[PDB]
């Protein structure tokens, strides 16, 4: 036992999908994601985990709003219209 015969007994998921990060790190019984720390308000990250921080940091997504802030600052956060 403890090898091939015992690997056959693996049919109960310790982790499922996390609502916040989707990594399948949500511990079913602890109700906590081992990756992003959900449902804690802060997102889990550690300075010893520099590679994990770089994997999950700003810019790894599509930056739906942040990507236009630089252009809006360059234009001075104007509010009117181009006025042909």
């Amino acid at each position: 036992g403890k090898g091939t015969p015992s690997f056959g007994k693996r049919h109960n998921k310790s982790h499922t999908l996390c609502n916040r990060c989707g990594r399948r790190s949500f511990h079913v019984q602890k109700k906590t994601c081992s990756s992003c720390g959900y449902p804690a308000a802060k997102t889990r990250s550690y300075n010893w985990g520099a590679k994990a921080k770089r994997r999950h940091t700003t810019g790894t997504g599509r930056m739906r709003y942040l990507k236009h802030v630089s252009r809006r600052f360059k234009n001075g956060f104007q509010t009117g219209s181009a006025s042909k």
Partner: protein
Amino acid sequence: AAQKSFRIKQKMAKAKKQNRPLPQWIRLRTNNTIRYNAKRRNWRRTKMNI
């Protein structure tokens, strides 16, 4: 499991829709460094891991 959550079925549907070869009109585009579908998945080779 035949009794699945909607989240699991939704991920299953996305995997089914993206389980296809590279479209043939690609490989005709101007630069087209893409040769084949490098992200192809099969149930017999790599598990989705949910």
